[PDB]
Structures are given as structure tokens and as C-alpha cells.
């Protein structure tokens, strides 16, 4: 294990837990499905964390996530990977630019740094055009 | 790196599709 995955399990669990109290609530859990574009039941939510919530408190702490993480895409990736690719694309034009990234960072929360946003596209980037095609995509997302 | 909320939206999402299979 990296301190870079580290440094990824963090930001991850740091989108649910929004007043950093270091349990994700169901109220979390829910707010961040809204900004998804979904609309879960109480119940939903509650089952989402009881499937993971190994002490039974009824919330979802560090390691608890971790095992969320840690369970496989692992046979129908591929059509949620394409449309993720779409909603990234804003454009439509089958690239993803640095303003795009920028924009998706955003409505995930995040609103720095610019050389960051440039850093992400850099290492997506395999065939150096300065952006992320479908196939680079692809192999960031399976990373 | 700083890709952690995509993993985590993508996850998510295909936890709470894999939520209402499984009940
Ligand atoms: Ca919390
Ligand atoms: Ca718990
Ligand atoms: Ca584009
Ligand atoms: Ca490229």
C-alpha cells in the first residue's frame, strides 16, 4: 500500500463525510446520492450501510469504507465506465479537456488546483494529445 | 492521483444499483 492510495482512500471517504466527524451517516450517504442524481429511500440507504457496517452502530467508519472500496466492479463496469465517460465529456466531441475534469472535480466538491487538474490529465494521457480520449479513460478508471 | 471522489461516486453508484438487487 502507497501513501498515494492512502492519500485517495482520504478524499474518497472525505466526499460522504462532509462534517468530518469520521462516520458516514445515512443523512451523508443520501445527500451525496442527490448530488448524483438519485433519489434514495431512507431504507436504501440504511440497507447500503448495514451491508458494511460490521460493528452494527448504524454508520459507516474508516475501515468499514475501506471494504466498500474494496468490493470488484468488478461484468457490467463497462456500460457504467461509458457513461461515466459521457457525463465527463460534456461536449460530446469524445475528449475530455482539463476545463471538463475541472467542472466533474467541482460537482464532486472539489474547486483546487488548477496544476492539479493539468497533473490528473497528464498521467491519463498516453498518447500525449493533451487530453483523455474513451480508451484512456477506460484504463484511468480501471487504475 | 486526486481521483479518490470518482472512485468513490463510481462506487457508490454501483453500490446503490447493487443495493436494490440484493433487496
Ligand atoms: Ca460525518
Ligand atoms: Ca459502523
Ligand atoms: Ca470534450
Ligand atoms: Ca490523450
Known amino acids: 500500500l502507497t501513501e498515494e492510495q492512502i492519500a485517495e482512500f482520504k478524499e474518497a471517504f472525505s466526499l460522504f463525510d462532509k462534517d468530518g466527524d469520521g462516520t458516514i451517516t445515512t443523512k451523508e450517504l443520501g445527500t451525496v446520492m442527490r448530488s448524483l442524481g438519485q433519489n434514495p429511500t431512507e431504507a436504501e440507504l440504511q440497507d447500503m450501510i448495514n451491508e458494511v457496517d460490521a460493528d452494527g452502530n448504524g454508520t459507516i467508519d474508516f475501515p468499514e469504507f475501506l471494504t466498500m472500496m474494496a468490493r470488484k466492479m468488478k461484468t457490467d463496469s463497462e456500460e457504467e465506465i461509458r457513461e461515466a465517460f459521457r457525463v465527463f465529456d460534456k461536449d460530446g466531441n469524445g475528449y475530455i479537456s482539463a476545463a471538463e475534469l475541472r467542472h466533474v472535480m467541482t460537482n464532486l466538491g472539489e474547486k483546487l488546483t488548477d496544476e492539479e487538474v493539468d497533473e490528473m490529465i497528464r498521467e491519463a494521457d498516453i498518447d500525449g494529445d493533451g487530453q483523455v480520449n474513451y480508451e484512456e479513460f477506460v484504463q484511468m478508471m480501471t487504475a | ?23
Not at chain 2, 7 to 13: D, G, T
Request: hydrophobic share 40%.
Open chain 2, 1 to 23: 492521483g486526486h481521483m479518490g471522489k470518482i472512485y468513490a461516486a463510481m462506487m457508490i453508484m454501483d453500490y446503490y444499483k447493487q443495493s436494490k438487487v440484493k433487496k
